[PDB]
Amino acid sequence: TFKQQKVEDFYDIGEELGSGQFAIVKKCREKSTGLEYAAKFIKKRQSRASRRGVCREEIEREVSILRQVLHPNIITLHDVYENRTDVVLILELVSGGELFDFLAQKESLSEEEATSFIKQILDGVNYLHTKKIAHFDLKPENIMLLDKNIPIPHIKLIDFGLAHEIEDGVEFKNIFGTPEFVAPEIVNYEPLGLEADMWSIGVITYILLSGASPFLGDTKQETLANITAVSYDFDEEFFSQTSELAKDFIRKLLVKETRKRLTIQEALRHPWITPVDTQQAMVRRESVVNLENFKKQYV
Amino acid sequence: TFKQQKVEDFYDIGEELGSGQFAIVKKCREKSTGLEYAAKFIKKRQSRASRRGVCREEIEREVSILRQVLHPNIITLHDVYENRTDVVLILELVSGGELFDFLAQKESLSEEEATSFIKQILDGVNYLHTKKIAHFDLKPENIMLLDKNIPIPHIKLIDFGLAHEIEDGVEFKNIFGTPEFVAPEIVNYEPLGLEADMWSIGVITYILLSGASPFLGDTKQETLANITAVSYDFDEEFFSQTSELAKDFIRKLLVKETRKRLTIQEALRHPWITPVDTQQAMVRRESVVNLENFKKQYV
Ligand SMILES: Nc1ncnc2c1ncn2[C@@H]1O[C@H](COP(=O)(O)O)[C@@H](O)[C@H]1O
Ligand SMILES: Nc1ncnc2c1ncn2[C@@H]1O[C@H](COP(=O)(O)O)[C@@H](O)[C@H]1O
Ligand SMILES: [Ca+2]
């Protein structure tokens, strides 16, 4: 249940850190402990027909999920307050910005370094999937870093606004997500599960390695058609330096049939992520990433 | 071609009329004639990946369709300007706000009066469909009034951002529109055509008469489920004064099978809209819109 108290009685509310549809995030400091957090103010929907704000039931669902998750690569919920207009999530403060913005200012990136970031994502997703929680909004802007000024920045997955607990024998279908990153079952309005997350990881990896996006077309119409046709390529212009193992990883994630798509456990065990011998570890270490196109696309 | 000139050089730009995704619409007056228009400032997309702006092709499509339409119940296009950030559509000014807001201030409303407004909409849609143009965004906010201060205001359909010319043999699929008003073929990502407009008219009619919404659930997920199941009723709480003629009209529009749904021509010739005898005309005259519920829902 949400605390029916004024958050500003308990926290000093500071500068705005970011925003999204429905939400404004401000830095804050809890008065009694002096510890800092991010306060995410979520505007409640006031009527069923309104397209503004979030339905309080859906906010409750996000909170229910967040309260269950404690893992180094997943944002940690601290508290929840409510007033007339907003539900306020007090979240672990993540100060390192978005992963992509960090990689975009980067000078040099090998596939070994790339997989270390991807593996952090896989660890977080694995933890969620074990608890039968689908994130359903895996995309660059929801992959943040605790501190961008350390040798190996530490990934935190945020934004559980679309997250859902998948129940066996209960069908879940909905239309949501950013076209560039949604799986074919989302576009086709077919039953949804943990597999959509794995497709998204395939897309994020593809972009991370090449700067290009596998299904993105001139228009949303084209993007959606491309996704449902699973029409993509590894254009040599952008993938000339990419290892076959990296491509194999992506190929096994960008698969229409949900049953055949890699599961999170299989992804974690794929040789690209977890080499089984020195020979593979070298190939990965020597494969250099395409920061030219990536920067063009994300700067 | 868009005029590569500063719209401000030729128009005095006045107060805001409304806004949308990457569009802001303002009153304006052309200096050379003193005539008033609405200027729709569409923000152009900068990269194929942004969730911001509108790409060249889609702006062009909207202009191309607007150029073709000249009908009393559809806004007319006057001119098009372009600068570095925006394409500006100079459109016929519609000053009387939205139809529903006008009906919501009404004391009393019979089905006869109601059908005369609905017939204005049908006339506009009939004109588009004859040119094989689907509007694809028929909903209350896009049904406006030229002048809300005359006894029986004239309807103008606006917002052709989703409009599309339907080509024989060429499949068109896309994901768009407001959940409450989209047809099952939109939700299911199946081939689209002129029929989607007809479903929307069914929903608009249902709400106009009763104040209730046929498929609206507590959440978007529910709404979409209701739509694809065509799960709706004529709850006597709201429809106890509505004619069987009106309900028949709605039943024939809210049909999943696109080939079975009324066409615009058939809707214009449905006896609720165009009675074939004196008796039907009386029934319509003796049936009443549920203004009580309508007002409740539209405030
Ligand atoms: N826990 C957090 N710590 C710091 N900044 C955040 C946090 N959550 C969200 N933000 C900021 O708010 C933006 C929108 O967050 P969201 O709507 O959850 O994706 C992010 O892109 C960040 O800039
Ligand atoms: N021709 C017009 N005259 C007056 N208001 C308009 C006109 N076109 C659009 N608007 C307003 O601006 C909003 C956004 O327009 P649009 O992006 O075409 O949907 C609409 O919902 C109306 O409130
Ligand atoms: Ca489908």
Swiss-Prot record, chains A, B:
It catalyses: L-seryl-[protein] + ATP = O-phospho-L-seryl-[protein] + ADP + H(+); L-threonyl-[protein] + ATP = O-phospho-L-threonyl-[protein] + ADP + H(+). Its cofactor is Mg(2+). The keyword Kinase applies. Belongs to the protein kinase superfamily. CAMK Ser/Thr protein kinase family. DAP kinase subfamily. GO terms for molecular function: ATP binding; calmodulin binding; identical protein binding; protein serine kinase activity; protein serine/threonine kinase activity. Activated by Ca(2+)/calmodulin. Residues 280-289 are annotated as: Autoinhibitory domain. It comes from the Eukaryota. The autoinhibitory domain sterically blocks the substrate peptide-binding site by making both hydrophobic and electrostatic contacts with the kinase core. The lineage of its organism: Eukaryota, Metazoa, Chordata, Craniata, Vertebrata. Expressed in peritubular interstitial cells of the renal cortex. Isoform 1 is found in the adult brain while isoform 2 is expressed in brains of embryos and young mice (at protein level). Disruption phenotype: No visible phenotype. Calcium/calmodulin-dependent serine/threonine kinase involved in multiple cellular signaling pathways that trigger cell survival, apoptosis, and autophagy. Capable of regulating both type I apoptotic and type II autophagic cell death signals. The former involves caspase activation, chromatin and mitochondrial condensation while the latter involves caspase-independent cell death in conjunction with accumulation of mature autophagic vesicles, plasma membrane blebs, and nuclear condensation without DNA degradation. Its EC number is 2.7.11.1. It comes from Mus musculus (Mouse). Keywords: Apoptosis, ATP-binding, Calmodulin-binding, Cytoplasm, Cytoplasmic vesicle, Kinase, Nucleotide-binding, Phosphoprotein, Serine/threonine-protein kinase, Transferase. The keyword Ligase does not apply. This is Death-associated protein kinase 2. Residues 11-273 form the Protein kinase domain. GO terms for cellular component: autophagosome lumen; cytoplasm; cytoplasmic vesicle; Golgi apparatus. It is found in: Cytoplasm; Cytoplasmic vesicle, Autophagosome lumen. The modification Phosphoserine is found at residue 287.
